[PDB]
Symmetry: D2
């Protein structure tokens, strides 16, 4: 049941946020975001067009070059971010509702995970503002040599629909900590939590233009950000094919890019694993957020000695999953985010059936309505298949037996992807050895799907370029200047 | 200057490629010619890497990265190999400086004192990094050990231009090799000699087979095969902004990390309170160093109105007094440009200048009987939207602009797609740092110009580059950060 | 015209001031109390519980327990960070109260306490709260056979002793860094200035610090102080004060092989070169020594002036000194309050007498001021030589010596010819001179065309006998940690 | 079977061993000399000039001048890096000669001196040579009004005292770091082991070090030693040795507010858990203590064993103990040499006697060995309790105590119940337990499924009474630096 501030918010046209003001599109167009558990329209939103992206970029450029954002001390900047975090925490329940409704995930996990992490991320990054240090370099008695880590300037950010608010925080936390200004676009299907959070940027005291939110569609608002001549740097998270596109376009202006694409991450259960823990880790690893997770462990490699114990257990778990609307207290898994996604993963499940794999559970849709799909366990698979090699992005897992550690490493690494990996073993040497050999940005030994503001994440190979979170994200938003002072 | 015996021996034969630790000819036998730009005579004939050879280099590098000594070796051991390489280059210093003078055209004494000495210092610097490329331990929670590993990216493909051939090979390889990567490297068709000579030293220093692979040839074939290679993990390139676009565009298809150092049109600013004597020398050397074939050349000298007339006079005199000649002639101060193609390209820029109405206060035409030479040139009476004021010429051509206020010169300096470097001349402590902070450029020299060192990073803002070379910074380009979480609950 | 007492201050002062141990406000085990005075009036400001050895022992046991188990030991770094953040928010909420206490107890002007001290306190906790999640060790690539990593672990129970010149802010320098690393604390404010800290204690409780993570033990140097210094179970010591007392602390710490951090005095030089911007340099020179009544480690107590400008600077510092409005801290027109105590006033008056005895000239001030309170007139000495006591020794009063010089090489040699090396300032418009002279001065901090600037992010401390180690900045964290190097065989 | 002397070693020993001060080899000012012995034969190995207080003064003046002016003060970081690298190349070229001196002078087996000590020396200089160009300070973004930056300056003239157990390699730990930062050195080798260092001195001269940058003063603790510790012009001190002497060094340093780095003893525990890999763990336990004849600060002198495995490990260590081939270092079959001196033999035999007196069982060894030279049989004590003197104190001989335990919580408590805290080893195949137990042990270094691993890149040092500070790694550089924070007003 709706919180009064959520009811109030949804009782009207959702404005975009530009130069510190809530505004309609210049051309006046609007679009609809739906509630995926019911298919009804949830809200009507102002539709950012190229001309609006261009007003936003002008606002961001002004805030970066002159005014309080440019003049502020690092402590002052830090306090703004810290105050933002406090405000988000205060509106925690309203934001969790907005995510549960717009995105579809269960309210309680949006609150406990998503919202909670957004808060922590902004607090972490506030801490960095006064610590982005450069170097003094002893080279010669004749010169003072030093580097300055300057903000890159105006940055364009594109956010997908699977962790809407949290992902906005990854991107913004680091960029704002360096002193940049932002032009950010949420996904067409999940613009609500961010647009609601814009009230909190204004209230925390952000100067006008520091952040600008332009909801809209990829090919118009999206592309306007990527192709914009006055945007200094771009960051994107999405499909590998759209990633290729952003990079291609960014080339035209020798523009730095940061991308986090998808994956087909392996979750490995070795013979000496703690089988109880590994099975729960294997199930959560794919099923968390309905499989709508870049780093989902969509390949559970299990040691031949435990294939059957595991495959059984995952089937019983997969059946037990209570599907429902996110705003229902008993819902464990919600629906996918859109009809397009629902089709897209149903078409993977069949494409896989037509390829010869068999279904130990799921493989269809769920409930009377909503963009739902049953949690699905595939069995009898081969490394060359479509469903083994490609990111499905639904709650579908392929389980593969193996007979040697050297084999599982080779097969785990035989992929164009390399976002993440899990390794379950109790042996100290094996766990480090294997994690060392896996070609992925993040490896969890005896766990899976753990993220924190302080630990970087991202892909090797076609899973991305660069890293998000940690100190590391900060380098994406900086231009290093080397100053030499002749003191001969 | 007389040829060294080891140079003579080297040029007395077909110049071979280096792949998998062996000197070899192109698989299909093709060869090409490199010239002596001061004479136009062929200097040597070289084996010509084709796509298939790049394929062989890449497989050798893949194998040396995945298994064998370079993969097993301690950081100390890798470091010592790199240190032994530097000692060897130092030993062959005179031979290498000769090759560079003959093949590139620059004067022998500066190749020795500058290029070859910097190459040695860069490898020594980077050897020191092997044992210090540290990751982090991150305290987050009592229930986990969190740590990062900075792993070498793998096989890296590198393309270097022709203006600082040996040194630029060192910028690239120093950092890559320090992280544990393996290299497929392509020198410019115009200047493959110093690199291919130096290959001997990689072998003798004890590099294992395939750790480094040198494939000379042409951009459209050898270059493209590197850029497009499915098994090359990361690429680095130095050159024109236009080819840079190409490289990044191509790298997109594989989600491949890029490092680029492109051109510039760097401002060199003389403020009113500058030590005008030192400023004049810095202005002149900032453009004329290496015949202007320098990314960071101070190609736009901005001069406070009060001093404009005075420094234009001096740069004109200095221009007209430089001794043009063959690099291997001891009286030479400036050699020719690198190729007929560059000589015409630059000449074309000067014509466009005159035609756009700028004045030629000095130079403006070719020099001597043969060779790709161009007279030092000073353009005057110029304006911000002129082709010559805005575009990288890459020859010994300067454009001199007067200005009236500091806010003005900052704005006009920054009004460019480029942002590689800048010079600021002032004796005031506040003005010098204030102006340096406001310039959009990777490197600013206060009361100096054109200084590089292994320890200080270099690169561009805007369309002058992505990423940095030199210093600790370069290392981040050759690494993949891995975050490991160990549940200890 | 009086600044009106804050109701919460009045309430605080209306009762015995308790100490803080294991999360509770308590009296001393033996019931002793001591008096703290208002140095402007000489009246008693409050009666405060006096910590004895037995009380330090109780605080150390509490701290030990909070470090070894309990929430502080189990909390994530984010959670520890949030505690620090909220404590800085509470400090800010009580900004006026805490500034009135500084003014009343220490003597300094209220507006300065507010704008400087309290605000710096707040920022210092905010800064350090940011470091909690960022205190990182290394992964070291050595060999394929081993995973090599280091951990920067909190050293443990830390003993901290704070002087009286910047009471609250000094407590924050000490505690912010240490708390950021996960340490637990036993801290002693100065006998003369225990109030601001004991009031602050309400705020540590309110923010939610677990029991015993911080422990405040007011009292005397020889009983409470020495008990901290000499305690078998305090893992590390931090101190700021006199160079003589510093020696004692290090000598005692030798017996347990205990890491020590110390910030001691100085005789910092403030150098005006020929090409200085004279108007800015005169103001810097005057504030450099007069700020906080000269009760400042880094005070530019030696003003070196290039021969050309010497007389011009002397005349200006004389006029400025004579124009200072002295008065109580809690009075709005006050620009410079009294010295912290009778003993300190007597100490500086003696130094002035020595200066006169030794042949120096009192160009201005040089005696006590007003009817009541520990006041001393801002003082300017001329006709001094390098071998004089007043030029070599820390006075810790609003007293300055002015010295002319003829060359840069000379001033650098004279500035460095001292046992001290806390700070220096250099005034010159020339880019090369600025940096060259900063490079040559043996001081932990050098201000070029400024003076007395401090920030949470920038380290502070002494060369030579001005100290060991640094406070503030990232640097201050390493004094609070032990480095553990872990080798994991992965062969 | 004797290892044949190298011509150069024979030529060196053929004469009086000179000291090295201001780039030249010279006699003591007062003509005094002392004898260093060969601990396997008890014969005099060489006569060496004995540095007095007057000699140390000469060395300090030389180092001071080298630090303040001349080539070392003007060299670029690359140039100073090159000197370090060349020195390492020279050490490598004389590897056999240096390993022979170590064996002869210290008594350790030649092959070990070679493969270990002398190769670690080389690598240690190569490592620190690489740091020369990378000792960076910070640019700190604080305000648009200022450029804030720090400089990590060399502290200056550093006094270094090194013991006799790893002569040459210890000199390298200390000088590598301190030389990388740009400091100058006054170093003293142990009375008993001056040869390898004085021989090495030729290499510093040959590598091209400027006059005075390194100065070697061999002699005695209470004369040459104390004079370093007490010199007014030495800016920092570093010492390795006994707790008791460490206390003295820190007490003396207090007088000048001088930074101290100390590595003292330990009683390190080597823990074998129930799921350990027993074969690996037994070898590691045995080597953990027997390496270098037990003359090792980090020696696993307390072998803790899980009850299940206690008797198996005891029998195994008894058998290995009695199988070691004792002999001269210069004899090819030698596995363990003598102790360094009659005095050290008398001390360890004393300890063994006390062990027997307090009720412990000598399961093996426990007496002297051979007919001449300072040998002691590898010894294994059982039937031991935590409060015995041999369990608590550092023996510094090839003596070990074996103790069973029944829970992991118990062994952490017993291992940590010590004033020492140098190192620990943990043997277990479980990923969780390894890290957990490593995290809870209070030791500077923890090896998981190994023991006695050292590397230039990894820090080493003690918690508690085992020391202050760290050596090796990037960390060791901080000990040789003074941090200067520069503020440039750019308003
Ligand atoms: N900042 C700098 O240091 C440099 C800037 N430039 C800029 O470029 C201008 C023209 O010179 P130009 O050499 O034509 O510039 P390009 O950018 O085309 O070439 C730069 C280098 O890249 C190689 N190359 C060319 N095409 C490809 C390709 N498709 N794939 C991979 N590699 C390729 C060339 O090899 P090859 O020589 O074999 O053809 C050359 O060594 C110069 O006047 C200057 O403005 C050029 C060089 C360096
Ligand atoms: Na929606
Ligand atoms: Na990639
Ligand atoms: Na050529
Ligand atoms: Na008081
Ligand atoms: Na000191
Ligand atoms: Na001896
Ligand atoms: Na200690």
């Amino acid at each position: 049941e709706l919180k009064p501030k959520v009811e109030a918010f949804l009782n009207e046209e959702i404005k975009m946020f530009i130069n510190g003001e809530f505004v309609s599109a210049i051309g006046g167009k609007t679009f609809e975001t739906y509630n995926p558990a019911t298919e009804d329209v949830l809200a009507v939103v102002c539709e950012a067009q190229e001309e609006d992206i261009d007003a936003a970029v002008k606002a961001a450029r002004s805030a970066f070059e002159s005014g309080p954002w440019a003049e502020m001390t690092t402590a002052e900047r830090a306090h703004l971010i810290y105050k933002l975090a406090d405000l988000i925490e205060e509106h925690r329940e309203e934001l969790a509702q907005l995510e549960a409704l717009d995105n579809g995930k269960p309210y309680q996990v949006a609150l406990d995970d998503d919202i909670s992490a957004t808060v922590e991320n902004y607090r972490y990054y506030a801490g960095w503002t006064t610590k982005i240090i450069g170097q003094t370099i002893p080279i010669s008695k004749d010169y003072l040599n030093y580097t300055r880590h300057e903000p890159v300037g105006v940055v364009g950010q594109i956010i997908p629909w699977n962790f809407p608010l949290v992902m906005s925080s990854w991107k913004m936390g680091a960029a704002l900590a360096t002193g940049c200004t932002i032009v950010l676009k949420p996904a067409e299907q999940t613009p609500l939590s961010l647009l609601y959070a814009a009230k909190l940027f204004k209230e925390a005291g952000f100067p006008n233009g520091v952040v600008n939110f332009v909801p809209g569609f990829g090919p118009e608002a999206g592309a306007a950000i990527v192709n914009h001549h006055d945007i200094d740097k771009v960051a994107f998270t999405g499909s590998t094919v759209t990633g290729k596109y952003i990079m291609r376009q960014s080339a035209e202006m020798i523009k730095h890019v940061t991308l986090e694409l998808g994956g087909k991450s392996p979750n490995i259960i070795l013979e000496d694993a703690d089988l109880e823990e590994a099975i729960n880790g294997a199930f959560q690893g794919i099923m968390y957020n309905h499989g709508q997770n870049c780093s989902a462990g969509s390949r559970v490699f299990v040691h031949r000695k435990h294939y059957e114990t595991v495959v059984d257990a995952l089937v019983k778990m997969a059946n037990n999953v209570k599907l429902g609307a996110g705003m229902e207290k008993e819902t464990e898994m919600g629906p996918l985010v859109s009809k397009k996604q629902q089709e897209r993963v149903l078409n993977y499940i069949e494409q896989g059936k037509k390829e010869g794999a068999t279904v130990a559970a799921g493989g269809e849709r769920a409930l009377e309505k909503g963009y739902f799909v049953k949690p699905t366990v595939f069995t009898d698979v081969t490394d060359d298949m479509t469903i083994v090699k490609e990111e499905i992005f639904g709650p579908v897992v392929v389980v593969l037996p193996f007979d040697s550690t050297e084999e599982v490493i080779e097969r785990a690494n035989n992929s164009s992807y390399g976002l993440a990996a899990g390794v379950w073993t109790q042996n100290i040497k094996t766990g480090h050895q294997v994690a060392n050999k896996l070609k992925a940005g993040t490896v969890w030994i005896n766990d899976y799907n753990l993220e924190n503001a302080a630990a970087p994440f991202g892909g090797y190979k076609q899973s991305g370029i660069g890293r998000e979170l940690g100190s590391y994200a900060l380098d994406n938003y900086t231009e290093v200047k080397s100053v030499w002072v002749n003191i001969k």
